[PDB]
Amino acid sequence: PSMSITRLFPALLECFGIVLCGYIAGRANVITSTQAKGLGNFVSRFALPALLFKNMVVLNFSNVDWSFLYSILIAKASVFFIVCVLTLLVASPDSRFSKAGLFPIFATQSNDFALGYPIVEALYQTTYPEYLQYIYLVAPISLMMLNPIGFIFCEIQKWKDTQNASQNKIKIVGLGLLRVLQNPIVFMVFIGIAFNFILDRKVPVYVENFLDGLGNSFSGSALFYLGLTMVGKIKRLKKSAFVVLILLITAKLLVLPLLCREMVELLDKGDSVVNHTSLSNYAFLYGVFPVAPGVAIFATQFNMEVEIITSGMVISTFVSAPIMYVSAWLLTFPTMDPKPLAYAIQNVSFDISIVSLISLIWSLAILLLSKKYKQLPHMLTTNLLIAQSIVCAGMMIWNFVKEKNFVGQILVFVLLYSSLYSTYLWTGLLAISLFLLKKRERVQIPVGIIIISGWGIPALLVGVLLITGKHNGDSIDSAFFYGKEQMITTAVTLFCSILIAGISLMCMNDQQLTRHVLLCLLLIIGLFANLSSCLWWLFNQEPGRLYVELQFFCAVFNFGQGFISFGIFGLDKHLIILP
Amino acid sequence: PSMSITRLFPALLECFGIVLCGYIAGRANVITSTQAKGLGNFVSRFALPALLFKNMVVLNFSNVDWSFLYSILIAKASVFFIVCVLTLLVASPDSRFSKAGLFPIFATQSNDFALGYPIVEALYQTTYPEYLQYIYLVAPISLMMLNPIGFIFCEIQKWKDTQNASQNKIKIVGLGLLRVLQNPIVFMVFIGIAFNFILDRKVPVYVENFLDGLGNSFSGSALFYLGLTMVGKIKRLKKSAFVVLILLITAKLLVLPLLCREMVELLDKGDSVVNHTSLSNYAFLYGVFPVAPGVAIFATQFNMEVEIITSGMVISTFVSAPIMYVSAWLLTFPTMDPKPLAYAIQNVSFDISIVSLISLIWSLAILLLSKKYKQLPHMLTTNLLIAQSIVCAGMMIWNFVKEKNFVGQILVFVLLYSSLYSTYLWTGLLAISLFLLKKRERVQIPVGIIIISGWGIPALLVGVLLITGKHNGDSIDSAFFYGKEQMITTAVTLFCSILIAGISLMCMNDQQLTRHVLLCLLLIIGLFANLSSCLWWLFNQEPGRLYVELQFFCAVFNFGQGFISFGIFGLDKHLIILP
Ligand SMILES: CC/C=C\C/C=C\C/C=C\C/C=C\C/C=C\C/C=C\CCC(=O)O[C@H](COC(=O)CCCCCCCCCCCCCCC)COP(=O)(O)OCCN
Ligand SMILES: CC/C=C\C/C=C\C/C=C\C/C=C\C/C=C\C/C=C\CCC(=O)O[C@H](COC(=O)CCCCCCCCCCCCCCC)COP(=O)(O)OCCN
Ligand SMILES: CCCCCCCC/C=C\CCCCCCCC(=O)O[C@H](COC(=O)CCCCCCCCCCCCCCC)COP(=O)([O-])OCC[N+](C)(C)C
Ligand SMILES: CCCCCCCC/C=C\CCCCCCCC(=O)O[C@H](COC(=O)CCCCCCCCCCCCCCC)COP(=O)([O-])OCC[N+](C)(C)C
Ligand SMILES: CCCCCCCC/C=C\CCCCCCCC(=O)O[C@H](COC(=O)CCCCCCCCCCCCCCC)COP(=O)(O)OCCN
Ligand SMILES: CCCCCCCC/C=C\CCCCCCCC(=O)O[C@H](COC(=O)CCCCCCCCCCCCCCC)COP(=O)(O)OCCN
Ligand SMILES: CCCCCCCC/C=C\CCCCCCCC(=O)O[C@H](COC(=O)CCCCCCCCCCCCCCC)COP(=O)(O)OCCN
Ligand SMILES: CCCCCCCC/C=C\CCCCCCCC(=O)O[C@H](COC(=O)CCCCCCCCCCCCCCC)COP(=O)(O)OCCN
Ligand SMILES: CCCCCCCC/C=C\CCCCCCCC(=O)O[C@H](COC(=O)CCCCCCCCCCCCCCC)COP(=O)(O)OCCN
Ligand SMILES: CCCCCCCC/C=C\CCCCCCCC(=O)O[C@H](COC(=O)CCCCCCCCCCCCCCC)COP(=O)(O)OCCN
Ligand SMILES: CC(C)CCC[C@@H](C)[C@H]1CC[C@H]2[C@@H]3CC=C4C[C@@H](O)CC[C@]4(C)[C@H]3CC[C@]12C
Ligand SMILES: CC(C)CCC[C@@H](C)[C@H]1CC[C@H]2[C@@H]3CC=C4C[C@@H](O)CC[C@]4(C)[C@H]3CC[C@]12C
Ligand SMILES: *[C@@H]1O[C@H](CO)[C@@H](O)[C@H](O)[C@H]1NC(C)=O
Ligand SMILES: *[C@@H]1O[C@H](CO)[C@@H](O)[C@H](O)[C@H]1NC(C)=O
Ligand code: NA
Ligand code: NA
């Protein structure tokens, strides 16, 4: 169709693989914090300028859909205004200016050159190569339009901090615009357009290889440097500052994507239907871009909200990969037939399993070698992780067994749904020990729950939906490998664990009890979607009211459970003694 | 034909422009020496491994001309053996093993991935893309074959330094091979061939973008890092160690290129004539590759001959650009008709003028702002540089005036040959003041020689060959813009300066008198070629005995004089106070 979603997963693997290489290099100490500066300087003062110059010089500027650009700039203006006003309305006067300045820059400025451009190039370079040029229009125009306002609030604050009796409103405003004009993304785009007109959009051949060679080294080096700078940045923040972060990231990864797409459809009236739709979806995906790291550099320069801005920028980077993936697949479902669409949910389930298995193997070795698994609640956690790991293996073979070897597909599906009910039940069991932690005097009982209930109940549930003989389901989805019975036993397996975890968590109100409630709290948001899908189907069989879409989110959660545990427990430092 | 020489100049501009960007960044202190380590680690442990892996995995290995590879490996074996034996025959016993170990590694190991591959890709990706794959065969096979021998000599030396009474010949040999096997160029090429067979030469699609993105960032980042590491490396070496360097660099930039080409023709009997010739010339250009910086890393690790190896590696890098350029153009002349061949010597003259002018403008500002120009012999030098600068302007317009505006071409040619005789005469005048420096009590006489002879004699000489009225020469070469008279006056202008400089230099036997004799000594090697060409022609008019080839070297020297002065006097540190 219009978007090459198939090419999206490898593009994400590239983008976030190189980021992870940089993170590992910085954690392994292969490159120290002082040494990472060299890579940053080369990418910011050489690789980036060359890329921007070259792309501005060739930009036709006579075939650019300014309406599409107008609608992205309008969406970002709207998010900037909302966040800034809300911050100025609830932030204490002392940090009101600093927060009203940086917050809306955080919520609108996105990682367009390093992360956005490879994803756009994968999705569009064959269908809509014209979409690529926008990256070099939107990002600098937005910097120019909106960053001066934020820097003006930050300078307004600096004045309060200095308590300077004098007043320099004009000077404050020139300090803001001057900070903007010294950004290479701005003055290099200026020089590049000047030479677009002088060189007549023709890069001098003699300098062409130099420009290509310097700009072709921007992407990998910048993604690697990104990884290096996310080392050690998430510091322990108060719940208040933790709510602020959730609100800030949501505005950039949710409100902006929705607004961008609504703006396009609102002011785009092109007479193609497929082209209006391709442009709307490109606007959504643009808005899903992660927060630019230059924002944390601004916060450092101004020395304001450094910890919250940097924590948020790192968290946003991590979180955008699942959201871009899932959003891009969801925007393609209206355009597919009911059969290629079930073959796509398997494609997606397979991709999530790939990355979830590697995340889980890492988190499992970390717990084992650290020996943290032999203490609670990490002992229960090390059980949920094992259950999640099994799933990712069964799914990656269920796609290789669906509609094949009905017999040998009774096991792969069984080892797929005992474990998967085990992960549903282990989520609930875990929130009990967290509650039992309050009753420390009361020694917990891992025995009888570690396996008797941990996997024994889940395993028995599969037998309940397996008693049927020769009931092998050619259904492309193991969820429908059986009749309503599978939906039933899955809807009630979910009901115990939904209430177990809920009541226990509320009743509950380095043991790491803070991160663990953060786990269960995220795992319950999943148990909500699957429970809804099972009952929703058990009400209107084969429902069409956004059900398949819900059937898709239940696949991402079922085989994405491990990746969640990874972000919580796989990056944690552990004393793993090989000897 | 077979080589795209036209595409060679832009490729060199890319390769050495990025190197110069890195050098400038390191001199301007944009990236410090500790910060440059980060870029090096990323390129060596990530960008390089990915590139090698990817290229080995896809290598067919069933369409590789092993005979061509055999002949390059044989030429390098031969140079390694010659240098090692000569070092073991003349080096004092104390450093004999260290020098016999590192010297032949220096003379054979070349900068194939960072510098070689873009040049090969420019010259060949359209005519012979099969030539590119060799870069990834020759370089690692050579590392494996020849580096263990050198590391064995270095370990043999370490033992003498430790004076360990015990003897571990086997252990010494395993230490050498172990050092070789830990080089990523070796074990990554191993892994890549293993997976060439396992993956059946098919890189997994899911990892393909990751591999391309990491390996596509190798070239620019590695050239930039190269530039950064050449900052401050040329230390003051004794004449002895200075002769050693000239011999070592000549073996790698001259003997190896000649041997490589002779080996190919010797053991290549393919039935195409154009293909045998294209392969011979590709072998020459391979051998002209600069010394790999990994060799200086070996010398650091072993802590042996660090200063000479690093100085030599930096000097070799600088020197290889003119040699690769000129060699590649010379290998194409047999294949061109007498008219496209005169239009090619103008092409070359134009390219050298481009880079010589920028080099001269830099060296001129450095002398002016430093105020060094107002002292001798820098005062005479600042005059020769000005004369060289004029030339580069007249040539870059002579190509735009040749066979055009006969009248307005009488000036461009005149301003081309007064200055050019001025550069010939200023070389001689300069070697006089260097001689006069010995007679310090004898105050020099810049007056009467600064302009009266510096440009007055040269200007009068042009009038001598200009007295002819309406003698405008449509000749594509300003050298033939006039009859034998131009060749005559040019042959005698050269004769004074050849003997002036010679007698004065011999009679002569921060004034910087060491670098200045190094200038005149190099400028006289040029005055030898032009003088020979003029007399050679004045003997056999329009001679065909390698004359045009000599006519080509006189063009490179005439418009390349500034670049020479740049490498001597443009990189020198100077106190330029703008205020
Ligand atoms: C659900 C899965 C579904 C689909 C996925 C499918 C496809 C995705 C595509 C490609 C996969 C590639 C990579 C995945 C993402 C990032 C890895 C790269 C670098 C790690 C840097 C890091 O590790 O960066 C760290 C900062 O990220 C953190 O912490 C993590 C915080 C994240 C929140 C915690 C929950 C985990 C899951 C997140 C999803 C939540 C919402 C999802 C929406 C659907 C820096 O760690 P520190 O050293 O600062 O501290 C370290 C702790 N001590
Ligand atoms: C002749 C011209 C003809 C044709 C040219 C045509 C095309 C060439 C193609 C592209 C041009 C691009 C770049 C030219 C080369 C290098 C520039 C890059 C980086 C500079 C690094 C540096 O600057 O690297 C320096 C180490 O190179 C040195 O010194 C320089 C020593 C070189 C020898 C001195 C003579 C100058 C000319 C060389 C030619 C000699 C033989 C030519 C054969 C034909 C490191 O300087 P340091 O800071 O260590 O010390 C600094 C001093 N205080
Ligand atoms: C004239 C107009 C042309 C168009 C505009 C050009 C735009 C090009 C755009 C992009 C091209 C590449 C730009 C990268 C460098 C400049 C941008 C920048 O801000 O970086 C600067 C480095 O700047 C440098 O160091 C200079 C390096 C340039 C060397 C060129 C080599 C030859 C290549 C030519 C190839 C072929 C040429 C053949 C000729 C025909 C960063 O330095 P800095 O940190 O800011 O300063 C120090 C500050 N502190 C930290 C010390 C305080
Ligand atoms: C299994 C076999 C496969 C084939 C072989 C692979 C070969 C690949 C070849 C090249 C690929 C890239 C190689 C670059 C790193 C490895 C080489 C190396 O020596 O570097 C090392 C870093 O190594 C790392 O840090 C690891 C980083 C890897 C992260 C991958 C991200 C996901 C991408 C997957 C994309 C999609 C995947 C989808 C899945 C379907 C350097 O570290 P070190 O300095 O030596 O150690 C520390 C030593 N001191 C200094 C501290 C003492
Ligand atoms: C879509 C349109 C959005 C409109 C309504 C969105 C709902 C959120 C609105 C307001 C919630 C803001 C307050 C949340 C909790 C803040 C707690 C708080 O008071 O901290 C204050 C933090 O408040 C701020 O600094 C600004 C608050 C966040 C600024 C941006 C607000 C988010 C706007 C975008 C949210 C959009 C998505 C939300 C729903 C999906 C700091 O001052 P202090 O507490 O007095 O001093 C102690 C230092 N922390
Ligand atoms: C979370 C687990 C279970 C929940 C299942 C849904 C999860 C959604 C998560 C967060 C809230 C995002 C929902 C956005 C709703 C906007 C839908 C919309 O209006 O798009 C309409 C149609 O949209 C489409 O074309 C396809 C639907 C997808 C749109 C949203 C796609 C991305 C949102 C999901 C990604 C968010 C987080 C995902 C990460 C796992 C536009 O037409 P309309 O006439 O204006 O409205 C039609 C409604 N009858
Ligand atoms: C064959 C096709 C793909 C195969 C698998 C691709 C993914 C492989 C990912 C990682 C493999 C290498 C991971 C560890 C290598 C080095 C570990 C290391 O030493 O750093 C350690 C820290 O490194 C880390 O923590 C890295 C954390 C993540 C590593 C593995 C993550 C799993 C991937 C999940 C993300 C999804 C992407 C999937 C990509 C396929 C030790 O640091 P420390 O504890 O602070 O103290 C310093 C002690 N040296
Ligand atoms: C093409 C086949 C080449 C064969 C003949 C090439 C002519 C060069 C042959 C021998 C010249 C070698 C000696 C030149 C000057 C060396 C002065 C010298 O004695 O220093 C000695 C330096 O000698 C060495 O270390 C090794 C000499 C250079 C090693 C490599 C020799 C170059 C071989 C390749 C040359 C090929 C091109 C030459 C002609 C274009 C050091 O020992 P020391 O002086 O006793 O202690 C004081 C510390 N320097
Ligand atoms: C230096 C200023 C004035 C001097 C003018 C010449 C400068 C040469 C510089 C250094 C010595 C390099 C000379 C290499 C001579 C090898 C020629 C050769 O054998 O190639 C023969 C033919 O060669 C050709 O096809 C074209 C000639 C070019 C070959 C050498 C090309 C590169 C050498 C020049 C580059 C060296 C430094 C240049 C940097 C400015 C092979 O056939 P043969 O039957 O074996 O011999 C035929 C002889 N009648
Ligand atoms: C428009 C098409 C091409 C236009 C021209 C392209 C070539 C432009 C080359 C260079 C322009 C920038 C050169 C200087 C920029 C910064 C100078 C600087 O501050 O670094 C200075 C050191 O930098 C240098 O020394 C660089 C030396 C070479 C610079 C220019 C070389 C001319 C090019 C000749 C090579 C041929 C390549 C030709 C490429 C077209 C100061 O360092 P310091 O004295 O040790 O003390 C530190 C005080 N800050
Ligand atoms: C849903 C999309 C479209 C908008 C993004 C909202 C969600 C995905 C983002 C907004 C704030 C993010 C959270 C903020 C902070 C933390 C704590 C940190 O340790 C990682 C997990 C967690 C919990 C992040 C998970 C994802 C998160 C909740
Ligand atoms: C001619 C080719 C094919 C072989 C290479 C030999 C020449 C070009 C190389 C070999 C050693 C080099 C010299 C060695 C050392 C110095 C001193 C240093 O300050 C730069 C100039 C100078 C003088 C270099 C100029 C070029 C050089 C003479
Ligand atoms: C729709 O997009 C396609 C793809 O680039 C383009 O060729 C076509 O002109 C567009 N149609 C309209 C009506 O703009
Ligand atoms: C000569 O080289 C060309 C260019 O690749 C190739 O197509 C041709 O097969 C070669 N000829 C012979 C006889 O090998
Ligand atoms: Na980011
Ligand atoms: Na080199």
Short mmCIF file of C-alpha atoms and ligand atoms in Angstrom, two decimals, chain A residues 110-111 115 226 230 289-293 313-314 316-318 320, ligand 15:
data_model
loop_
_atom_site.label_atom_id
_atom_site.label_comp_id
_atom_site.label_asym_id
_atom_site.label_seq_id
_atom_site.Cartn_x
_atom_site.Cartn_y
_atom_site.Cartn_z
CA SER A 110 11.87 15.55 18.67
CA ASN A 111 14.74 13.34 17.51
CA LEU A 115 16.01 8.46 14.83
CA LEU A 226 22.75 8.85 21.96
CA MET A 230 21.70 7.56 28.31
CA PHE A 289 9.30 10.76 17.40
CA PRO A 290 11.31 10.61 20.70
CA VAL A 291 12.53 13.77 22.56
CA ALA A 292 15.65 15.37 21.05
CA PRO A 293 18.76 15.14 23.28
CA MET A 313 14.57 12.36 27.36
CA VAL A 314 16.12 8.96 28.06
CA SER A 316 11.12 8.88 26.00
CA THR A 317 13.76 7.33 23.78
CA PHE A 318 13.24 3.89 25.28
CA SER A 320 9.08 5.46 21.61
NA NA C 15 15.77 10.79 21.85
#
